[PDB]
């Protein structure tokens, strides 16, 4: 994948988005996500993986102050609420709009309308890895029919009977929690489903085309290295597109087969 | 025993120099007592009213369905003043009321209110305006049947 074609695509997509919005103007140009589209020869996964994978970016996402983050932890919620209120930095304290544990989530958000209200009240959901396997049943298809606001895994367990939540929380140190939360908020998300298509939010239209180029390129290397089986022999097509724009191909393959075994005489 | 434990915790809070609201939480209970429930219905604070079917004297509750209809309160007549007493730790309760519940039970309360409205009130809307009683005894019914078949044959 040559970087010049991608960065040329960055100017072209941004110019088209701006001239389409011109037909507030600045608010319309802003908050418009940029989607990198993976097309593979086969299904990227054999089943629906409901925990998104994190790809670290040089230019992090969700850096705006208006983004509200809901953090779901294990019991008790009081310890993490006190940690947010006292031992967190001010930017993260302003960004985190809700701290709720799994027990209170199952109690107060069993209703579908309650789940939809929780879905609409926040933008980014982070979830402790000790309880993230129970969140599909707690949040239903409201959070998992769309891959946009699926709970991002965070690690809050202290790395090594029934644990009493009041007596012990079994948590890693607070600066490590802060670093993990910042990393997970800034990371980009990849979602694995039995499909030939995978869409990744890499940036916004108001960003600079070089930052789009860098973010797209690092998403390309980490995604093909980690989450794509059979590496580049599975890779068919790479596109960049917006919510309403067309797809600009930045990489198109030369062989349409996985290997020579697919070709039979 | 629960009230004694709560008062002990509040006494410790006062001793350490804190308000009792700092240690105790706002309670949510089933409201009971006939005068209290009638006052709540008149102030339109009650969300659901359950009225015992066997109150003697009946005048204590004979106005209460009409009061609930005037105030737009969902009500239901239920079997057992002793059954309501088991809710309120008494031998007998003439009437109980729900005003507000916790957030985890708001959906259940709304579903119960809708279930009462659709399955009790709409069904008894026409039957509540009719007269009761007037049933004959067994021998009187048999005599009347013999009389009407005799008249039909003759």
């Amino acid at each position: 994948v040559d970087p010049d074609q991608t960065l040329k695509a960055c100017k072209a997509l941004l110019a088209h988005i701006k001239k389409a919005a011109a037909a507030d103007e600045e608010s319309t140009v802003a908050e418009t996500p940029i989607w990198l589209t993976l097309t593979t020869k086969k299904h990227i996964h054999d089943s629906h993986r409901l925990q998104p994978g994190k790809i670290i970016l040089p230019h992090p996402l969700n850096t705006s102050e208006e983004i509200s983050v809901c953090l779901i932890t294990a019991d008790p919620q009081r310890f993490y609420k006190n940690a947010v209120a006292d031992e967190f930095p001010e930017d993260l304290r302003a960004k985190i709009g809700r701290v709720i544990d799994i027990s209170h989530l199952k109690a107060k958000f069993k209703a579908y309308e309650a789940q939809r209200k929780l879905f609409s009240e926040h933008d980014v959901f982070l979830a402790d890895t000790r309880i993230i396997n129970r969140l599909p049943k707690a949040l239903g298809k409201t959070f998992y029919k769309t891959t946009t606001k699926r709970p991002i895994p965070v690690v809050l367990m202290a790395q090594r009977e029934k644990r009493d939540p009041l007596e012990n929380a079994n948590a890693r140190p607070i600066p490590e929690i802060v670093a993990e939360i910042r990393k997970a908020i800034g990371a980009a998300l990849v979602h694995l489903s039995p499909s030939t298509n995978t869409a990744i939010k890499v940036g916004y239209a108001n960003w600079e085309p070089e930052k789009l180029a860098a973010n797209i390129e690092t998403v390309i290397r980490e995604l093909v290295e980690r989450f794509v089986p059979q590496k580049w022999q599975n890779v068919r097509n790479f596109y960049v597109k917006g919510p309403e724009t067309a797809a600009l191909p930045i990489y198109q393959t030369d062989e349409l087969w996985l290997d020579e075994s697919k070709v039979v005489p | 025993q629960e009230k004694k434990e709560r008062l002990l915790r509040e006494a410790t809070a006062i001793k350490e120099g804190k308000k009792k609201e700092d240690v105790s939480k706002k309670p949510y209970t089933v409201k009971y007592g006939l005068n209290h429930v009638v006052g709540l219905i008149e102030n339109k604070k009650a969300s659901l009213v359950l009225i015992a079917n066997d109150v003697d004297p009946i005048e204590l509750v004979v106005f209460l369905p009409a009061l609930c209809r005037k105030m737009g309160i969902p009500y239901a007549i239920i079997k057992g003043k002793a059954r309501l007493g088991t809710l309120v730790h008494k031998k007998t309760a003439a009437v109980v009321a729900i005003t507000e519940v916790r957030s985890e039970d708001k959906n259940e309360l709304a579903k119960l209110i809708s279930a009462v409205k659709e399955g009790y009130l709409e069904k008894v809307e026409d039957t509540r305006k009719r007269w009761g009683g007037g049933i004959m005894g067994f021998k009187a019914q048999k005599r009347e049947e013999k009389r009407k078949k005799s008249l039909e044959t003759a």
Binding site: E113 | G39, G72, K106, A110
Partner: peptide
């Protein structure tokens, strides 16, 4: 708001009746 809260708080248009002013 919630439809459950609307269902719980739904009343009629007749104004409330109070025995006295309360604190």
């Amino acid at each position: 708001g919630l439809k459950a809260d609307e269902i719980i708080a739904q009343r009629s248009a007749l104004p409330a009746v109070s025995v006295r002013k309360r604190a």
